[PDB]
Design a protein around this ligand. Structure first.
Ligand SMILES: [Cl-]
Length: 97
């Protein structure tokens, strides 16, 4: 008899999710989902960011995440956290570049 913490408590996410052809930015779709699970979302990739949700984004974002050891996760990671109702290991659903 105890209620769970917000699923993505303490996650501070920057979202860069584009269509493959680069014409459409879907970052708002995923910002909303993250906030509903208790993450904070930053409009900029600043020093407080812990996670970058990345799909077909900018190479500079990829390289900066790698340099800083910020977790680079796919939109599938977001889905799988929602499905599990739990903060799933980021190693399971890495982003691809
Ligand atoms: Cl896990």
């Amino acid at each position: 008899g105890a209620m769970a913490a917000p699923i993505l408590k303490d996650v501070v996410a920057y979202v860069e999710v584009w269509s493959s052809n680069g014409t459409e930015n879907y970052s708002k779709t995923f910002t909303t989902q993250l906030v509903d699970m208790g993450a904070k979302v930053s409009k900029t990739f600043n020093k407080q960011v812990t996670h970058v949700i990345f799909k077909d984004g900018y190479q500079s974002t990829w390289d900066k995440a790698q340099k800083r050891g910020v977790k680079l996760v796919s939109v599938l990671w977001v889905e799988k956290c929602r499905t599990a109702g739990a903060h799933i290991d980021e190693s399971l659903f890495p982003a691809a570049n």
